[PDB]
Amino acid sequence: IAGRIVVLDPGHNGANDSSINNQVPDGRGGTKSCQTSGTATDGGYPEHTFTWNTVLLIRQQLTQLGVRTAMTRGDDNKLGPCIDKRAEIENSYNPDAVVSIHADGGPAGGHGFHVNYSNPPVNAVQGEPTLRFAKTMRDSLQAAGLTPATYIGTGGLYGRSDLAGLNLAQHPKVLVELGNMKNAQDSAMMTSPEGRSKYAQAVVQGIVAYLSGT
Numbered sequence: 001i002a003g004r005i006v007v008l009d010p011g012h013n014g015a016n017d018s019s020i021n022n023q024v025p026d027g028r029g030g031t032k033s034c035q036t037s038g039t040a041t042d043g044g045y046p047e048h049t050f051t052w053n054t055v056l057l058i059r060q061q062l063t064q065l066g067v068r069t070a071m072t073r074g075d076d077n078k079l080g081p082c083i084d085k086r087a088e089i090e091n092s093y094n095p096d097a098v099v100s101i102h103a104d105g106g107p108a109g110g111h112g113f114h115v116n117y118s119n120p121p122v123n124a125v126q127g128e129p130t131l132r133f134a135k136t137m138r139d140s141l142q143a144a145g146l147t148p149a150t151y152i153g154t155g156g157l158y159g160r161s162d163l164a165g166l167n168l169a170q171h172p173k174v175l176v177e178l179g180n181m182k183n184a185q186d187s188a189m190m191t192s193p194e195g196r197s198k199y200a201q202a203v204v205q206g207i208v209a210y211l212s213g214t
């Protein structure tokens with residue numbers, strides 16, 4: 001584990017302007033918006049702040065394990081990089097694994113996590129190395145006591161073709177939607193410092209299990 005390289009992507013920006021509506025190539029024949037604002041709890045806790053703070057806790061834990069780390073943005077209050085640039089930044093580190101952190105907006109009764117991965121793969125590394133990452137992450141999150149999303153995906157997994165950050169990956173990568181910000185239970189956990197710590201520890205368990213060959 002020590003000496004491996006992991007890049008962490010806290011989804012969305014600290015702030016936005018109309019540049020986020022410019023279209024960028026999506027890695028699968030199309031284009032999509034440079035960025036989106038992301039969602040928020042009904043209490044007003046923004047997705048971009050949840051992902052930022054959770055990624056900071058993941059980074060701190062990985063560094064203590066001897067893992068070399070980088071992030072795709074440096075703050076939670078200004079314009080951040082477009083989704084295609086974030087994939088380029090991740091790729092430039094030649095990482096062993098990449099984890100993108102998001103939180104979702106779904107029906108209010110729906111809760112739990114889902115692990116998004118590229119499907120069908122557009123290159124070799126998006127095949128078995130990435131599907132294994134997705135399954136291992138899902139297993140680790142569930143073994144940590146988190147609930148697979150009750151409202152989307154299949155047992156906490158979601159293979160998809162529409163995400164530029166996944167299509168553009170040159171290294172094993174998953175995008176973890178940790179929960180539904182519009183749900184009472186997930187909102188409480190996301191808004192809780194110790195809830196963010198528990199999310200972060202479970203993600204780290206998934207990273208360790210994947211890099212260890214579990």
Ligand SMILES: C[C@H](N)C(=O)N[C@H](CCC(=O)O)C(N)=O
Binds near residue numbers: 032033034083
């Ligand atoms: C994952 C989320 N539902 C989403 O669509 N995010 C969106 C697109 C990310 C991508 O295509 O890589 C975003 N701008 O963060």
Ligand SMILES: [Zn+2]
Binds near residue numbers: 102
């Ligand atoms: Zn998001």
